[PDB]
Write a protein that binds this ligand. Structure first.
Ligand SMILES: O=c1[nH]c2cc(C(F)(F)F)c(N3CCOCC3)cc2n(CP(=O)(O)O)c1=O
Ligand SMILES: O=c1[nH]c2cc(C(F)(F)F)c(N3CCOCC3)cc2n(CP(=O)(O)O)c1=O
Ligand SMILES: O=c1[nH]c2cc(C(F)(F)F)c(N3CCOCC3)cc2n(CP(=O)(O)O)c1=O
Lengths: 174, 169, 60, 173, 61, 97
């Protein structure tokens, strides 16, 4: 949900702020150790936390790093919520009006037959828009054979669709 | 004693060498219109073999300022200059240690140079807007070694300060 | 016989349920895996450091 | 949300990290104790004492990040369930009436539908006719609107079977 | 026919606006910038305060 | 003890009621009462967070009516015309479906 590259920068800023803590805590105790500074940097990195400093400089370094990572993990929470909101979006195609409502996934029929004569001699404006799309496609969406359309759909991964009879579709489904 | 100082010196030398290698070439990789490598000044495609300076700064004012920072590598070149100055200060403080107070300023300058290197890495990552090159990983590892060498240097400094406070009493 | 029993596919059971109207498990197993890995790593590090501490304390 | 079976995995991981924390904390020769380690694992699980052994503290930190990711994903998935609210129908296929028995189903008492279910050769529809002909009480309705009122007063417990055109006509009223 | 249907823009106020993007770094870069600014501010404040503390300790003796 | 006072018990109940918190008990019974109440109110305020997120997700839903297809797509808000006129004759003698 965030990235696979911002995390390394987060770890680099984490270890840099731990270097800052081990510097300034030993530059003016409780945070004298490198594990103490790294542990307080870990506690400042998360929400909760242990050993409270008393200095001006250490507390202001904690206040810089701590609201920073607060906004970061809050943004992680909101971003994961947005991705799961995406996860339950629009149902798949179930009608011809669903085909008319979209333009990302293309579709085609056979180059000849009464199937093409149905769309060519149609009167319903939805199917008229379908025949307008199929007659003005760039390039031509028509295949010569049925298996050519099957291979065109199978090499699409959700980009091209095909229209056919229901019995033939249920047989090729099985 | 001297072994930790020599380890800090060779760590600073290896960090400066990896920083020079990060300045040099192969910093990032991006498939252009085939793959191509870049070193923040020029691009080299995978005709084939030629290289050209693809660091074009033109095509609110914050976007133009960020583009001006990302152009010509203002942060990492000055960071490498500060690392070289800190290495020269550490080499000057290694022999004939007269005053025991310049080592803290040298360590502070070294940590600030590492922080500016991390800021320049953040700028170079933000200027990317698909994989990464070797010199970005080398600069990251040099940042790790520079942080460890800074921790070792300030540990030797607080040990020397504790020795001076024990000998003064 | 010829469209269902002759065919080479299974029953129309999209799977367990009708659709994915339920809990996620995909990230859960991987974060379990990295937790078990970090747990075993910290356990072996704790074991070797206690062994080193016992070897230092027994030999003064 | 997020778990129907993985809750036991969460509890088992909680007990395991508690055992590891007690094994680190109470074997070094304060924070030792099996109830103290278990309650500190509880304190690490939710939001709001710290070990100083620097080896089980790594275990506490990785468990602490672990349950932070858990509660973040919990908030996200609970918002995901509260957002869309696209509840689905319990019955999808024709074999679903043979698959369950809680929600009942019936046809009309007289007509070609009862002869279709009676003179069927499919074993699924044979089991359907065996269930409907031996139903307790009688599922057969007199008229069509009686079956409509039977379905509308069922609240998801009884369904009616009829022709598709009449069903789609009543569906659009 | 010749304007809404003949053209190539079949958007027609499409509800499909998924856009499965994880996260832009532009939401992260300025936050890194204010992080580095706060860190440098804290470094210089700690340096000048310890410098004044050392000067006061040298003057008090 | 440490939680001997009524303000001490109320303050630890307030700390267990929120996420953060102060004075750690050591008893079996007090810690298990805290563990009962604390994950309880954790789930409550997490549900508050998700519920407010859902309400603000509702807050930026579908734009208002801007076309005749928007009128055809809905059925909750009704509409009407004048009882007579060439406006009603336009809809009566129409050809667009
Ligand atoms: O008279 C016709 N009878 C047809 C009978 C069938 C079949 F179902 F196999 F019996 C099919 N197919 C269905 C689709 O996959 C390829 C074969 C096509 C037919 N067509 C061509 P149409 O005009 O495009 O329908 C005719 O003309
Ligand atoms: O010839 C027949 N034509 C029928 C036509 C209809 C319909 F057109 F739909 F009105 C119906 N209904 C089904 C549901 O709505 C109420 C009446 C029943 C018919 N029946 C009795 P069946 O034996 O149960 O099929 C016949 O015999
Ligand atoms: O010849 C006609 N000329 C019209 C001129 C007007 C006006 F705009 F005021 F000039 C109006 N209105 C617009 C709406 O508010 C009420 C008055 C109605 C007219 N009508 C009735 P219609 O057939 O329903 O259009 C006619 O028949």
């Amino acid at each position: 949900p965030l990235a696979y590259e911002i995390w390394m920068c987060i770890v680099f800023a984490y270890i840099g702020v731990s270097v800052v803590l081990f510097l300034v805590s030993r530059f003016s105790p409780n945070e004298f150790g490198i594990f103490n500074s790294l542990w307080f940097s870990l506690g400042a990195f998360m929400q909760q936390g242990d050993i409270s400093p008393r200095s001006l400089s250490g507390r202001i370094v904690g206040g810089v790093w701590w609201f920073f990572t607060l906004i970061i993990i809050s943004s992680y929470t909101a971003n994961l919520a947005a991705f799961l909101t995406v996860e339950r979006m629009v149902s798949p195609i179930e009608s011809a009006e669903d085909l008319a409502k979209q333009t990302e996934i293309a579709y085609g029929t056979l180059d000849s037959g009464s199937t093409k004569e149905f769309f060519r001699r149609s009167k319903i404006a939805v199917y008229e828009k379908m025949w307008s799309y199929m007659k003005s496609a760039e390039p031509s969406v028509f295949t010569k054979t049925t298996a050519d359309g099957v291979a065109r759909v199978r090499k699409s991964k959700g980009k091209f669709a095909f229209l056919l009879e229901s019995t033939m579709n249920e047989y090729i489904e099985q | 004693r001297g072994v930790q100082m020599l380890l800090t010196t060779v760590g600073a030398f290896a960090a400066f060498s990896l920083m020079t290698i990060a300045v040099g070439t192969d910093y990032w990789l991006y498939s252009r219109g085939v793959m191509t490598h870049s070193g923040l000044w020029r691009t080299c495609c995978l005709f084939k073999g030629l290289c050209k300076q693809i660091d074009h700064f033109p095509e609110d004012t914050a976007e133009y300022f960020l583009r001006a920072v990302r152009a010509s590598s203002i942060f990492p070149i000055l960071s490498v200059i500060l690392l070289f100055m800190g290495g020269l200060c550490i080499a000057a403080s290694e022999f004939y240690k007269t005053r025991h107070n310049i080592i803290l300023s040298a360590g502070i300058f070294f940590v600030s140079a590492g922080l500016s290197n991390i800021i320049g890495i953040i700028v170079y990552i933000s200027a990317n807007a698909y994989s990464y090159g070797w010199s970005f990983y080398f600069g990251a590892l040099s940042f790790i070694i520079a942080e460890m060498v800074g921790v070792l240097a300030v540990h030797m400094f607080i040990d020397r300060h504790k020795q001076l406070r024990a000998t003064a009493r | 016989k010829w469209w269902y029993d002759k065919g080479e596919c299974g029953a129309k059971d999209s799977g367990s349920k009708d659709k994915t109207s339920a809990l996620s498990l995909s990230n859960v197993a991987g974060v379990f895996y990295i937790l078990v890995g970090g747990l075993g790593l910290a356990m072996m590090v704790a074991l070797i450091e206690f062994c080193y501490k016992s070897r230092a304390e027994s030999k003064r | 949300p997020l778990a129907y079976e993985i809750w036991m995995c969460i509890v088992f991981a909680y007990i395991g990290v508690s055992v590891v924390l007690f094994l680190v904390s109470r074997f070094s020769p304060n924070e030792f104790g099996i109830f103290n380690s278990l309650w500190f694992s509880l304190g690490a699980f939710m939001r709001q004492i710290s070990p100083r052994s620097l080896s089980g503290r790594i275990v506490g930190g990785v468990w602490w990040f672990f349950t932070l990711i858990i509660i973040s994903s919990y908030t996200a998935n609970l918002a995901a369930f509260l957002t869309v609210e696209r509840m689905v129908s319990p019955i999808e296929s024709a074999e679903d009436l043979s698959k369950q028995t809680e929600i009942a189903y019936g046809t009309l008492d007289s007509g070609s539908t009862k002869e279709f279910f009676r003179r069927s050769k499919i074993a699924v529809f044979d089991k359907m006719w065996t269930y409907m002909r031996s139903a307790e009480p009688s599922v057969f309705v007199r008229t069509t609107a009686e079956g409509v009122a039977r379905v509308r007063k069922s609240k998801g417990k009884y369904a009616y079977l009829l022709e598709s055109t009449m069903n789609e006509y009543i569906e659009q009223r | 026919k010749w304007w809404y249907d003949k053209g190539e823009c079949g958007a027609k106020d499409s509800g499909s606006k998924e856009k499965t993007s994880a996260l832009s770094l532009s939401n992260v870069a300025g936050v890194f910038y204010i992080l580095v600014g706060g860190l440098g501010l804290a470094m210089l404040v700690a340096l000048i305060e310890f410098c004044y503390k050392s000067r006061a300790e040298a003057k008090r003796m």
